């Protein structure tokens, strides 16, 4: 129903071969993670990755009850009271360069279709100084400006990454959707002003942690949450399903509305995300519902949706629930609920499952605990460790060991450099244990003290 097979087109190349290679650490740590299945003939699975990858799109939740509209409206009122309603569209130059609260558009990333077929890059289709598109791209943009997204095709392929061993064996490989470059430019034009503002004020008050640096913001987040009796963690991750098409409609008319300062065309842009045409080799699918991965605004949209959904679930579960009975901190599929009340998220899970949404605990368990505090929760694979008046993001051990066990040739040193800044919060003994396999074989890795100094100095 939600996945319609269109007529075939030309073959867009899809990578069937991982770029990931094992490090010296793999044989020591032996993680229950490995490169995702990219090929029909992978011996590590019995399933067909092409069938399994798209199975989530075969069914989609048609409708949502009235409570979702009510929560979206109220969440919108709180956001735009904080962020203001100056959310008009940016110019193409402004979109390319970016505003104070956001980076410029990456010129090295894929231009999308049909440019990848013709062997072109983003720098070929636009001049970055003048902000001038080539005749073909200018016509495409003007077409979209007339509310017509008819010939926008997302370049779709399998995501080359580490997955849990269970997902490898079931061929549960994630999908990447790359939109055309002019679709990305339009998207940043329409939502970039809001986004830059949204990503620069992460915290409990906004309800979002998007755009945070965990090194600094863990203290702010932690300090705001420590006064609450309880903090629960919620995971939205679900390979088998995607966002309802109805959710896009709610955001279009309750959140990203003209009354909240957005351009008239946003409704149509959001529709091009909700119902999208995707190219996967020769095959062409029309997919109803779901968020494309490669859209710059994806993680922001997912964060907002999931914030709305958890309160909707609470209203659906508890007749006497009120908006301010909890505080929410959302980041993509990860969510914290801070409250003084005792809440039963097993019951909330049952309520949300009636609307096609799955929630699980953020940790290993299969059931939600009745009691949960700040010290118990996991958020972006990190716990909250108190350090005087500060909080530090202590990353899960299995996560660190998995990251250290594989790499991409060429970028090893900068991967290890990033991991030192994650591993520092686990203490010197653990830090040295994690990097021991590398410097036993002669690799120089920054000392614990050098990286600990850097973090400490952030608050002096």
Numbering used by the authors: 1 to 460
From the paper:
Interestingly, the three virus pools each contained a single missense mutation compared to wild-type (wt) virus. These mutations were located either at nucleotide 7115 (A7115G) or 7127 (A7127G) resulting in amino acid changes M300V and I304V in the viral RdRP, 3Dpol, respectively. Markedly higher inhibition constants were observed for the two resistant mutants (M300V, 26.9 μM; I304V, 10.3 μM) as compared to that for the wt enzyme (1.3 μM). The apo structures of the EMCV M300V and I304V polymerase mutants were obtained using the same crystallization conditions as for the wt enzyme, yielding two different types of crystals for the mutants. The M300V mutant crystallized in the space group I4122 form with one 3Dpol molecule in the asymmetric unit (a.u.) and diffracted to 2.2 Å resolution. Structural comparisons showed that the mutant polymerases were almost identical to the wt enzyme. The main differences were concentrated in helix α10, which contains the mutated residues, and in the preceding loop B. The side chains of residues 300 and 304 participate in a large hydrophobic cluster linking α10 with helices α2 (Y75), α6 (F194, A195, F199), α7 (I210) and α8 (L241, F255 and F256), included in the inner fingers. The substitutions of the methionine and isoleucine side chains by the shorter valine in the mutants imply a weakening of these hydrophobic interactions. This could result in an increased flexibility of α10, including the disruption of the last helical turn, and of the B-loop, which appears to have a key role in GPC-N114 binding in EMCV 3Dpol. In addition, the substitution with valine may disrupt the interaction of residue 300 with the compound. The structures of the EMCV 3Dpol M300V and I304V mutants suggest that these mutations increase the flexibility of this loop, thereby affecting the binding site of GPC-N114 and probably losing a direct interaction with the shorter V300 side chain whilst retaining the ability to interact with the template-primer.
